[PDB]
Amino acid sequence: EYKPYKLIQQIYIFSSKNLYSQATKPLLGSRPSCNQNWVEYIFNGNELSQNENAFSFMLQPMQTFLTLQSHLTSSLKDTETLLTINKEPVKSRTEIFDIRLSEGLNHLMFRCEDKISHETEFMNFWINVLP
Amino acid sequence: INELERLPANLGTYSLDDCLEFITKDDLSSRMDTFKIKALVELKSLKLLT
Amino acid sequence: VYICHTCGNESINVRYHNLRARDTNLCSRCFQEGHFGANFQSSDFIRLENNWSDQEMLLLLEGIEMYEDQWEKIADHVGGHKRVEDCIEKFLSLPIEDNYIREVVGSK
Amino acid sequence: IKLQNLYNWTPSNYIGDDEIENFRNGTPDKLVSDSLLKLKRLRKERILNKVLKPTTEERELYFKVKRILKEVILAKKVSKVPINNVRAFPVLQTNYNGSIPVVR
Amino acid sequence: KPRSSAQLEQLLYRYRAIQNHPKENKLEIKAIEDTFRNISRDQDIYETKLDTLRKSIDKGFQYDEDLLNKHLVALQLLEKDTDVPDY
Amino acid sequence: LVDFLVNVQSILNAASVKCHVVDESFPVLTTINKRFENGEYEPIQGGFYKLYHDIKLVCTILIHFYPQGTRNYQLVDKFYKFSSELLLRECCRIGATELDKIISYDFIKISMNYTVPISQTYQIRTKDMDLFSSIISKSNLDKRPHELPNTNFKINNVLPQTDIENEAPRLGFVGANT
Amino acid sequence: VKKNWSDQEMLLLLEGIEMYEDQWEKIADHVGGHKRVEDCIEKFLSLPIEDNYIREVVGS
Ligand SMILES: [Zn+2]
């Protein structure tokens, strides 16, 4: 069972630039953050294969916002793209997103389907936010 | 009590006898928590003085 | 035999006693995998032998901390392979203040 | 003037004259024993009228004792220096933080 | 003057960050320069004295065992801030 | 030099008493010990690489039987994990995103890099709960495809912790008599 | 030559002391990258001493 994705190319689940901008740059002379820790989970879609389309990782309680920058380029057509954090979809802003997690264990289902020809490609995540 | 209640709670011990058990990077070495127990004993025994 | 508190299976040869819920034991497999609750971390679990030493001394001090006026369960906290009266004398004869007292202070 | 007069500098780089006259006239134990006595006496005078953060004089004497025993063992003056190490030392550990969410 | 091998490191981080724009605080640049010029004096004296201590060394004496232990153990005990009983 | 090959043989023949990997025959078949007593390994890089190639070949051959969970499979895997990380560390000592832009714009990056084999896990949603399983013990030298014992399991890929340094309580949070 | 010790260096120091008892040149070679006798014995006088040994020495 090995089928590299032919629709999605790369996905970057990194830290939201808005959270960072309020962590390194104080607001009205506020005190800096106790520490800083950022992470960019890159997933090369060409190397990864479906039937193994589930991933899991953990974040600190400080990281409660993240922006799934999708990079879908192997389609070159008009293609449906949607993701559903906790089975509720979020709208887009290449395609930049913006996700607000919760204090538990939440999964976000990224989905892309071409309209010309019916090829569907899923990608799921599980982001344990630690209390 | 002050000097003992500020030690790292993840304190472990690397001993010169773990070579003979061939600990791998993905297993648990025996006698890993040796100074941790020896520190908890000296701490709880100082709290249990009265 | 101690039972793990997460998978519900018997411990094999060693247990991992956490020190914030002092009645909770976790087997070895569920400590590498980190299958324990997300409230704790893997920095308060002590490795203990299932089957006087630092382990038994720590368990004695934990039994005395958990229960003050009951000396029967103290033996059931260290497993129990000796008389109920060895722990009383072992606790009374600990030289824990002598190290700090020495620092300060005919008929022929 | 500077720059490799600072990279090697440690706060234990003062010899004065005592260690020179002694190590020249021999008998360095007459200096280590005397300084260990001036450490114990200045420590009993520290536990009494309780204060912490050992004074600078005690730190300087501890440096002097360290430098003397180090030079003695270095020049091969002790036959089979005693080995009494614990054969273990403290090390930190990583955190396999919990993998199942808390329920409240 | 610094009294640790780590305080001088920050005294140099400070001089490294202040010297970028001179003529703003001259009494901090001059002070740090004076401190460095006294530390290079101490370090040079110790450098030229550590050889005189290994040249004027004496060969007629050999430090004895069962007395070095009574000094190594007593030094480790006195450095851990624990008492050493009167011998 | 040659003083290291005898130490490697003394470590392998001391850690293979339960794995039984140096007494296995591979292509006329010869074992690993029958390569030490008669010089075929050399202090040069070719000898070290020949030894690592032989250890990997024997572990690979042994892994393809002792099918999946038998102790004879996990012990050989733990031996390959010990031997590879041993020979490596001794041969070494002998011989754009939206956030990355602002970070590289405002910070200097002293980076490091390493590669860790990923591990997998089975996971499902029974009727109302999303729950996983234990870490599958399949080796990293096995090339047999997954069987999916239920034809409804989903293969989660757990990412190793990338934070080498972490914080911990001060042993006052572990204690505090009750 | 560095002047700050680490965990793999205190480890190799302990191993060198266990194997070689007074040959400081061989201990320093085992921890190659540090001073021969100015840093391999300074970190020896500061190493702890076993508790049983201290008890038996101070007692007798
Ligand atoms: Zn368990």
mmCIF file of C-alpha atoms and ligand atoms in Angstrom, chain C residues 4-9 26-31 35, ligand 1:
data_model
loop_
_atom_site.group_PDB
_atom_site.id
_atom_site.type_symbol
_atom_site.label_atom_id
_atom_site.label_comp_id
_atom_site.label_asym_id
_atom_site.label_seq_id
_atom_site.Cartn_x
_atom_site.Cartn_y
_atom_site.Cartn_z
ATOM 1 C CA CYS C 4 -1.557 -0.477 36.184
ATOM 2 C CA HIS C 5 -3.876 2.508 36.432
ATOM 3 C CA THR C 6 -4.210 3.181 32.689
ATOM 4 C CA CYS C 7 -4.289 -0.076 30.714
ATOM 5 C CA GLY C 8 -5.732 -2.132 33.567
ATOM 6 C CA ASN C 9 -3.164 -4.899 33.082
ATOM 7 C CA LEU C 26 1.639 2.699 36.012
ATOM 8 C CA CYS C 27 3.377 -0.185 34.269
ATOM 9 C CA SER C 28 6.567 0.216 32.263
ATOM 10 C CA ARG C 29 5.002 -0.068 28.801
ATOM 11 C CA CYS C 30 2.633 2.823 29.554
ATOM 12 C CA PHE C 31 5.602 4.988 30.570
ATOM 13 C CA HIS C 35 0.000 6.524 27.876
HETATM 14 ZN ZN ZN H 1 -0.306 0.415 31.595
#
